[PDB]
Amino acid sequence: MNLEINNFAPAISSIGSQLCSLSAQKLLTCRKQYGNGAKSFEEFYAEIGGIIGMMGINSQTPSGIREAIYRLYQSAFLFGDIFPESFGIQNTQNIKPPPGFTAPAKKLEVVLPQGGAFDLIYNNGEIRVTTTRNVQAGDLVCTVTFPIQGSVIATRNCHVNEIGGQLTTTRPEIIASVPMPARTVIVASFDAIEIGYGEGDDLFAIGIAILSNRFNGQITPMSRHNYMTQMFANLPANMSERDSSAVLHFAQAAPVVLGMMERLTGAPKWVLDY
Amino acid sequence: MNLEINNFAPAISSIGSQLCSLSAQKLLTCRKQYGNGAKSFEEFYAEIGGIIGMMGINSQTPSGIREAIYRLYQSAFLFGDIFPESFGIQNTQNIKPPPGFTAPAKKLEVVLPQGGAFDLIYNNGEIRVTTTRNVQAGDLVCTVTFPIQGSVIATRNCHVNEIGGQLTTTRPEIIASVPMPARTVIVASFDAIEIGYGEGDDLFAIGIAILSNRFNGQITPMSRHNYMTQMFANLPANMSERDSSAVLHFAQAAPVVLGMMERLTGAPKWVLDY
Amino acid sequence: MNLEINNFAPAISSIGSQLCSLSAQKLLTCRKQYGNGAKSFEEFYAEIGGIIGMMGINSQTPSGIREAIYRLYQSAFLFGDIFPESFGIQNTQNIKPPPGFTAPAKKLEVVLPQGGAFDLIYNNGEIRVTTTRNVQAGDLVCTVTFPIQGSVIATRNCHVNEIGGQLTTTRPEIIASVPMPARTVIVASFDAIEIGYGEGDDLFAIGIAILSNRFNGQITPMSRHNYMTQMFANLPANMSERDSSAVLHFAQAAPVVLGMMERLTGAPKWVLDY
Amino acid sequence: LDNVIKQIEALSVIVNRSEKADDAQILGPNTYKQLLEHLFSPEENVYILLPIQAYTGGVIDRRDASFSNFAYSIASKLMMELSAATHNKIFTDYTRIAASALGPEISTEGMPLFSLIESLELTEAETSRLPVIQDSMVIQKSTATVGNAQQGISTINIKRVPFVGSAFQQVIDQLLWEYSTTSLTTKEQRRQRITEMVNDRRIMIQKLTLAEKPQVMRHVTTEINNDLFFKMSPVAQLYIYHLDRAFLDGVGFTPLAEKQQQLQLQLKTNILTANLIRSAINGMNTESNLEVAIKMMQAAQLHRASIEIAFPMNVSLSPEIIVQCFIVWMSIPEQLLSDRSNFIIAAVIWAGFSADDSYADIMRRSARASDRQNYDIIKAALSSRKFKLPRASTTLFDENEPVVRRYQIGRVYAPFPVDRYGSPVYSNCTKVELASDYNAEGFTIRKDDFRALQAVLRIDEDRAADMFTTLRIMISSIPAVWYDAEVVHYPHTAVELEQLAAYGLTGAYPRTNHSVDTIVKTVNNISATYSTIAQMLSTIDLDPTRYGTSESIDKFKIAWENVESVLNMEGNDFVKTIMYAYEDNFPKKDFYMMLKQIASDGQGAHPIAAAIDQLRTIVYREPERFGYIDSVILTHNPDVDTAYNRFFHLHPIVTNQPSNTIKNAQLWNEMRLEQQVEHIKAGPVRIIGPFHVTYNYLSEEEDMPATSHIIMKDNMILNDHLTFNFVKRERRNNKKRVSSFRYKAVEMYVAVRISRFQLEVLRDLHDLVRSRTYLDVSKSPLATTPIRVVEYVR
Amino acid sequence: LDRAFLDGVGFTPLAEKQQQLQLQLKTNILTANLIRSAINGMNTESNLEV
Numbered sequence A, B, C: 001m002n003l004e005i006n007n008f009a010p011a012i013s014s015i016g017s018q019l020c021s022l023s024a025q026k027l028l029t030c031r032k033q034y035g036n037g038a039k040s041f042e043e044f045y046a047e048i049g050g051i052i053g054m055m056g057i058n059s060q061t062p063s064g065i066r067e068a069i070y071r072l073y074q075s076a077f078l079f080g081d082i083f084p085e086s087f088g089i090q091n092t093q094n095i096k097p098p099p100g101f102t103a104p105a106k107k108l109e110v111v112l113p114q115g116g117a118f119d120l121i122y123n124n125g126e127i128r129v130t131t132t133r134n135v136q137a138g139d140l141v142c143t144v145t146f147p148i149q150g151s152v153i154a155t156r157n158c159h160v161n162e163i164g165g166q167l168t169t170t171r172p173e174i175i176a177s178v179p180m181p182a183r184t185v186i187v188a189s190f191d192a193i194e195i196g197y198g199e200g201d202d203l204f205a206i207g208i209a210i211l212s213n214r215f216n217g218q219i220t221p222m223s224r225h226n227y228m229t230q231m232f233a234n235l236p237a238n239m240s241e242r243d244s245s246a247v248l249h250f251a252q253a254a255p256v257v258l259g260m261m262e263r264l265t266g267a268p269k270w271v272l273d274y
Numbered sequence D: 001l002d003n004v005i006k007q008i009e010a011l012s013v014i015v016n017r018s019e020k021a022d023d024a025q026i027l028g029p030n031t032y033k034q035l036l037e038h039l040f041s042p043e044e045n046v047y048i049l050l051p052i053q054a055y056t057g058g059v060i061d062r063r064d065a066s067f068s069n070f071a072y073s074i075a076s077k078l079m080m081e082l083s084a085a086t087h088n089k090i091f092t093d094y095t096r097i098a099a100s101a102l103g104p105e106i107s108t109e110g111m112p113l114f115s116l117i118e119s120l121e122l123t124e125a126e127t128s129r130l131p132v133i134q135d136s137m138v139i140q141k142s143t144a145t146v147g148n149a150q151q152g153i154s155t156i157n158i159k160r161v162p163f164v165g166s167a168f169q170q171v172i173d174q175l176l177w178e179y180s181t182t183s184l185t186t187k188e189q190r191r192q193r194i195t196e197m198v199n200d201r202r203i204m205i206q207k208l209t210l211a212e213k214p215q216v217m218r219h220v221t222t223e224i225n226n227d228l229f230f231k232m233s234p235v236a237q238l239y240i241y242h243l244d245r246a247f248l249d250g251v252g253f254t255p256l257a258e259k260q261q262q263l264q265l266q267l268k269t270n271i272l273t274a275n276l277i278r279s280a281i282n283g284m285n286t287e288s289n290l291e292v293a294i295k296m297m298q299a300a301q302l303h304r305a306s307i308e309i310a311f312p313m314n315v316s317l318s319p320e321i322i323v324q325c326f327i328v329w330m331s332i333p334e335q336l337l338s339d340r341s342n343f344i345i346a347a348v349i350w351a352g353f354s355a356d357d358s359y360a361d362i363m364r365r366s367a368r369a370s371d372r373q374n375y376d377i378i379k380a381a382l383s384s385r386k387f388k389l390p391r392a393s394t395t396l397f398d399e400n401e402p403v404v405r406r407y408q409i410g411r412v413y414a415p416f417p418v419d420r421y422g423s424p425v426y427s428n429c430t431k432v433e434l435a436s437d438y439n440a441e442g443f444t445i446r447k448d449d450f451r452a453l454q455a456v457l458r459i460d461e462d463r464a465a466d467m468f469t470t471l472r473i474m475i476s477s478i479p480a481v482w483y484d485a486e487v488v489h490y491p492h493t494a495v496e497l498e499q500l501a502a503y504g505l506t507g508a509y510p511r512t513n514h515s516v517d518t519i520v521k522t523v524n525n526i527s528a529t530y531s532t533i534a535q536m537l538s539t540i541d542l543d544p545t546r547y548g549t550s551e552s553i554d555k556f557k558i559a560w561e562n563v564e565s566v567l568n569m570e571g572n573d574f575v576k577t578i579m580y581a582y583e584d585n586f587p588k589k590d591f592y593m594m595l596k597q598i599a600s601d602g603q604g605a606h607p608i609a610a611a612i613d614q615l616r617t618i619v620y621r622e623p624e625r626f627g628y629i630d631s632v633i634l635t636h637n638p639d640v641d642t643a644y645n646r647f648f649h650l651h652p653i654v655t656n657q658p659s660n661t662i663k664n665a666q667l668w669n670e671m672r673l674e675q676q677v678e679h680i681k682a683g684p685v686r687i688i689g690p691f692h693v694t695y696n697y698l699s700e701e702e703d704m705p706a707t708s709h710i711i712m713k714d715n716m717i718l719n720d721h722l723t724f725n726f727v728k729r730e731r732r733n734n735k736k737r738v739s740s741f742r743y744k745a746v747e748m749y750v751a752v753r754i755s756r757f758q759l760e761v762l763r764d765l766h767d768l769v770r771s772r773t774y775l776d777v778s779k780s781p782l783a784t785t786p787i788r789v790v791e792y793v794r
Numbered sequence E: 001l002d003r004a005f006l007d008g009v010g011f012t013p014l015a016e017k018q019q020q021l022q023l024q025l026k027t028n029i030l031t032a033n034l035i036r037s038a039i040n041g042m043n044t045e046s047n048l049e050v
Helices: A009-032 A041-048 A062-078 A201-214 A224-233 A241-262 B009-032 B041-049 B062-077 B201-214 B224-233 B241-260 C009-032 C041-048 C062-077 C201-212 C224-233 C241-260 D004-017 D068-085 D115-120 D129-134 D167-180 D187-197 D226-230 D233-247 D256-266 D276-281 D289-301 D319-331 D339-353 D359-365 D368-382 D447-456 D464-475 D497-505 D516-540 D553-566 D573-581 D588-600 D608-621 D665-670 D673-682 D741-745 E014-024 E034-039
Strands: A118-122 A126-131 A140-143 A149-156 A173-175 A185-193 B118-122 B126-131 B140-144 B149-156 B173-175 B185-194 C118-122 C126-131 C140-144 C149-156 C173-175 C185-193 D028-030 D038-043 D046-050 D089-091 D140-146 D154-164 D184-186 D216-218 D308-310 D438-440 D443-445 D494-496 D632-635 D648-650 D685-687 D694-698 D723-728 D751-753 D760-762 D769-775
Touching (some): A009 A062, A009 A241, A062 A241, A118 A140, A126 A140, A149 B118, A149 B201, A201 A224, A201 A241, A224 A241, B009 B062, B009 B241, B041 B062, B062 B241, B062 C041, B118 B140, B126 B140, B224 B241, C009 C041, C009 C062, C009 C241, C126 C140, C201 C224, C201 C241, C224 C241, D004 D516, D004 D573, D068 D608, D154 D184, D167 D608, D184 D187, D187 D216, D226 D516, D233 D516, D233 D573, D256 D276, D256 D447, D256 D497, D276 D319, D276 D443, D276 D447, D289 D494, D289 D497, D308 D339, D308 D497, D319 D339, D319 D447, D319 D497, D339 D359, D339 D368, D339 D438, D494 D497, D516 D553, D516 D588, D553 D588, E014 E034
Antiparallel strands (some): A118 A126, A126 A185, A149 A185, B118 B126, B140 B173, B149 B185, C118 C126, C126 C185, C140 C173, C149 C185, D038 D046, D046 D760, D140 D154, D154 D769, D184 D216, D438 D443, D632 D685, D648 D723
C-alpha cells in the first residue's frame, strides 16, 4: 500500500474511534431489543440504527455513517497533512487513551545483520537460526523491529535482557552466550502481545475489501498482521508512543466497523469499550 | 519473594475483589460520560471517578482507593500481622464465587522425578524429554505441579489418563507406553488453561512495579506466570478449592487495578465481572 | 535524549517555575496543619492541595497542576514548538531572576586537545592526566566544556588564571608551566559549583521516571548530572545567561516537583524561594 | 411559602419588559481639567514652578505596619474620583485659534501666555519671545490602533495639541487618556461582528452610511459566548425549570366532559351494565394540568430530568391504577419517562396478559438496577404477533423563529406524541389486537375496551398550529449547552399517576402568550449577572498565593460579603431569587467555587486595577503634590540648605544629619520632658512616620501666618498638620537681605524642619509647553446611535 | 465546669425546620406522609441539657 500519515493524525483518530464506538453501542442496543421475527433484522437496523448525534455528522442513515468513516479515514491516512480543526475538535491534546493491545504475537519479525552468518526459520511463536560458520559468543544474531512485550519461555543457547521472566526492552536483541560451532540451532520463544488487537478478525476481512474498493489506488486487501505492520512502519518519526496508539486503534477499528455494519453480528470489546 | 498467606485470607480477598470491581465499573462509567473539552481525561476522572462508598475507604479521590488496596494487600499477603477492622469484614459469612480462570497454559511446570535420565526442554504448547538410557514401559517420566485443565492434543510415545479428549485430573502425569531405546523423544502438547487470567497483562507490568516500590524488601517485579506459581506454592495445604480461587483472584486483581488507575485505559472483563 | 528548545523557552519557564513554587508552598502549608487522624496524608493532600486562582489551570485538584506541568514541559523542551495560548503570556521579555546554582561540581566535564597526548582519569573533585609523550611548557592540556565557578585548590605542575584563589573565567583552561618529561602526572582540584541545584536529588530520580513514562520517545531515566549536561548542550547559541538560567531552573524543577507530588515530603529551598 | 418567589419572578419578568435605553456603547465630548499651578521668577531666565497640592485624600495607618498601604489608599481614593468624571466621555474638545490666511491652526489650551507677563515679571527682552512661542504651538496629527483579536482591529485618528503647564499635569493627562481609551472600536467592525454572529439571512442589519463607518464606539471587555453558558451547568436545571414555569402561563387541554361522551359513544356496551374502564375516568379531574405540562416540557428539554412517577399502590392493584397505566402507556412517550417509570407500567400491563406471572412476583423477582432491560423484554413481548399494544413515542425538532441571540441552540423532543404531519407516533405497530382478555386478580377488561380507549386517545388535528408555536419559541430561546445539565431538586421531576393520566387523556399541551425576544432578554440578563460577579471576583478576590482551599470556614463571611452585595443591585434579582430559594440543594460554597473557576478562566479584570497600579507609582515620586511628607526633623540649631536660598528668602529646609530616629510621633508624645530634652541636646532628632503637611508660599510683603508646630502645654507634643511657610524671592526684592526675625520669634526654641524638597527649574521660556492627546472628531467622530435591525420603514 | 462555662445554645427554631421540610418535600395532604406527622410533633425545650 501507498499512504502517508499526517502529523495531526491522533486528533482525527480520536473522533473516528468515538464514532465507531457509538455505532457499535447502537448496534448492540438494537440487537438486544429485537423481539419480533416478522421483520428481517436488517430492516429493523436500517430503520433506526443510523440516528447518532455528534459534531460534524448530520445524517440519520447508515450511509451517512459510512461516508463519515470514509472521510475521516481518507483525511487521516491516505492524504498529507490536514489540520484537525476542520472536523471541529475543540482541543487537540485532550484525547482519551485507547484500550491496550491484546493481539497475540504468533509471527515475530526479526532482521539478521549483514554477512549471512545465520539462517532464519519462523515457527508458530518462536524463531530458530542455523549457524553456517564459526561464531564467537557475545554478538547479536537477531533483532526485533516490531515492538513486542510479554514474558519469555524456552530460551536455549541464547541470552536476552530480562528480569523475572519479563522482557526489559520492547525490541529485544538476541545474543549468544557460549560459542557453538558446526551447524547448530538456537531458539527464542516468547509469550508476548504485538501492536494489533486479536478479536474481530473476520470482520476485518469483510471490511478491508469494502474500504479497498473505494480507495483502490492506495488500499489493498491483505491479512490483519501485514496491514498493522505497514501502518506502524509508515508512521512519522517524530511521534510519541502515547499518540501512536491512538492512530493505530482507529486504523484497525475502521475496517472492523465497516465489516460489522454489513454482517450485523456483535462487536469486539476493544471497539465498543473505548 | 517472601510472603506468608494466613487463614483469614479469603475474607480480605473478597473485600479486595469487590473494591477492584467497583473501581473498574466507575472507570468505565466515567469513560463513557467524558466529553472533549478544556479539562483532560485524568482531571475529569480525579474529580468523580474516585468517589466510591464502602466501609473502610474514607476518600472521594483515587488516593483513597490506592491506600485501601495497599492496606488490604499488606493484610492478606505480606509478612506483617495486620488486619483492617474498619472494612466490611465482619459480615463475610458467605463469599461470592470468583470468575473462572482463562489464562492459556503456555509454559507448564513439570518435575523430572530422579536419576537425571531425561533432559527437559520447553516449547510454545508442548514439552519433550530425551531418554539417556533404557526405560521400562508404564513408569513415571514427568508429572506436573501447576494444575491445568483442558484438552490434550498430539501425544506421541506416551499416554495420559484422558477420555473423550478431556483430561480426567487437574494434575496429569505422562507415562511411557513401550520400552524405548536411548535418544528416543516423547512429546505431549496441551490445549489447557492454567491458574490466573490472561487479559490485562500490560496493566500487570505497571502495577507490580507500583506495589513493589512500596514493599521494597518483600516483592520483586517479575512476570505474571512466576507470580502466580509462587502464590500457588505459598498457599496452605488445608484450604478448599473455593477459597483459594478467591485468594488467587485478589492476588492478580490488586496489581492490575493499581496499574489501571495509572493508565486510564479500559479494564479486563475478569476484574470487572466479579 | 532528543529535544529541541525554541526561542520562547524563557517565557514558558517563567510560568512553569512560578507554578512549581506555588505547588510547593501549598504542599508545606497543608503539611503544617495535618490533623494526624484516621485519614492518611495522601488523602489529605489530594483533598486540599490544589490551586484555585491561576489562569491556565482547569482543576482544583493536584491533577490539574500535574497536567499543566506536562503541557508546559512539552511546549518548552520537546519537539512540538507549540505556543500555549491557554496560559496568559503578556510580555516575553519580563523574566524574574532565578536563584543561583548550588550543585557542587564533583565530576567536572573536560575534553582533551585531540593530539592524543594525555590520559584522563577522574576523582572526587579533581582531574589528573598523565603525559603519553614529551610535552613542553606553555601549551594546552585540558579545557572544561561545562561552565564552572568557584575557587581553585591543589594546583600542581599546571597553571590556571586565578585572582586570590578564585577562578577568573567560567571555562578555565589547564596549561602546563614546566617542561615535564617521562610520563609525569599533573593534578587540578576545584572547590567550585557547577550548573543546577544539589538539593532534592531524591525527588528528581522519582520524577524523571514519572515524566519519562509519558514522553518515553524523547526522555529516558538517568542521573541529574547527565540530564543537566545534555540540557545545557541543547541550548541555543543565541541565548544570554539571564535566560538560560530560567530555562535550566524550570528544566530541573519540573521533575523535582513531579516526584515531590508523589512522595509528599518537603521541598527544596531553590524551589520554594523562587 | 411556596408562591413567595412566583411573585418575584413575575415582577422581574414584567419589569424586564419596561425597555431601558443603554449608553454602554455611547460616548460624549470631554475636556481636560486644569490643575492648580503657581509659578514665579526670582531672576532673569529662571522660572520656578511650585508643586501645589492637587489631591487631599489620604489615610495614615495607625498600626504603622507599612508605608505602601498609605500610598495605595491615596492612589485608590484618587482614582475612584478620577474615573467618575470620565465615565462615558472622550477628550475631544480644546481651545484654539482657527486657521486662516494669517497662519496655520494653533493652540491656546493651558493658561494664557499673556498672564505670564504679570505672573513672572518679564522684561521687555523676554516678552518678545512670547509671540514666537504662541505661533509655534501647532497641532500634529497621527493615528492609533484600537481593538483586540476577538473584536476588529480598527484605526482612529488622533491629535497632539500643545499646552503650557507642568509635567505633572502631562503625566496625569496621559494616564487619563490611556485609561479612557480602553475597549474602543468602530461601527463597521461592530457591524461585521454582528453579521458574523447572526448567520440567519432573514434578519437584515441596517447598512452604514459613508459618514457612519469611521465612527467610534465602546465595546465590552470580554464577549459573552457559549463557554460562559457551559460553566453554569450545575445550577442550569433550576434556571430551565423557572424559565419554563414563568413563560408558560396556559395549557391547551380539552374539557373532560367531551372525552367522557366520546368514550361512551365508542364503547359497545349497554348503559345499564357497569364497566370499570368507564367508571374510572368519571373520578378524574384536569386539576394541575399546568404543573404536569411544565414538567413535560422540562423532561423534553433535559434528557436527565426524566419524569419519576409516584404510584399509590405498594403490592396490590386497582381498576383506577390499571386504566391509568394503560392511558400512560398509550398517551405518554417513553423518552420523557424514567426507566423505573417505564418498567412499572410495563409490568402492570404484562401482569394481565401473562398466562402465569403476577404483579407481586414481577416486582419481587426484578431488580431496580436492570429495569431498562426488563422493560425492553416486556415491550418486545407486547410487540409480537400474539399481542400488539402501540407504545407512544416522539421525535426531535429543529425549527426556530429568527431572533438575535449570542448562543447556539439545539434540538429537543416534543412533549406530545404526534409528528409534523399531525399523525400519532408509536414505537411499534399502530394496530391493537390481542389473543385473550386482561385478567389480574379479579379485575377484567374486554378486548374491545382497549380498542375504544385507543380510539378516544386521538389528539385534535385543529390545535396543530397552536401546538407548535410554543415548541418553536422554546427551541429558539434556550442554550444548547444546558441540555446536558444534571438534576439538583428532585421534586421538580416528580408527578403522581393520576395527574399524568388526566394530562394524557385530555391531550394537553403547553401554551404561551409571550414572544421569543423576552425569553432571550431574560437569558441575557442571567448571563450579565454571572459576568458581573465574575468580573468583580477577578478584580478583587483572584489571589492564588494564600487562603485558598486550606482556609478555615471562619473566613467565608468576608469572602461572601462582596458577592451578596453584588447580588443586591438592580438587574440581578432573577439569579438572587433562584440562589436564595434553593440554598439547601446548592449551597453557597459550591456556588462561590463555581464563580471562582469562571473568573480564573480568562475573565478580564476592570481596567481601574491597572490604573491604580500605575497611579500609585506616581504617588511615590512626588509626595508634596498629594500633601504628605515622609519624615520631619526636630532640632535646636538648624542649618539652612544654601541651594534653595536662590529661590526662597527663607525656607524650612535643613540638611542636618539626624541622630536617634524615633519610629512614630506617638512615641515622642508619650515621652516625658526630661527624656525629650536629653534627645534634643545630643543632636537633631528625627520622627519617621508619615504626616499630612501643607505648604504656604508667601510674598515678602505679606505677614506670615503663625503655625503651632509643637505645643508645650504640658509636654512637647507634635501637631498632626505641620503647616510650613515659604517666602518667595522675586525680581522686585532679589538684591535685599531679609532677617529671620519674624520666622524665629514666632518659633519655639525647638524647630520643626524639612529634610527634602522638590521643584522644577526652567532655563528657557519655551520649555513650559507640553502635549496632550485628543480624538479627531472631524475624521473619527463619536457615534451617536446604536446599530439596529431594519424594521418598520416609513 | 461544662455547665458553668457553656452559657447558652444556638439552634434554628422548629418552625423554620418545618418550612424547610415542606419546601424540600412537596407532598400533597391526604396522602399519609408520616415524616411530617412525626416532625410536627416535636419540641425543643430540652436542647441545653443535651
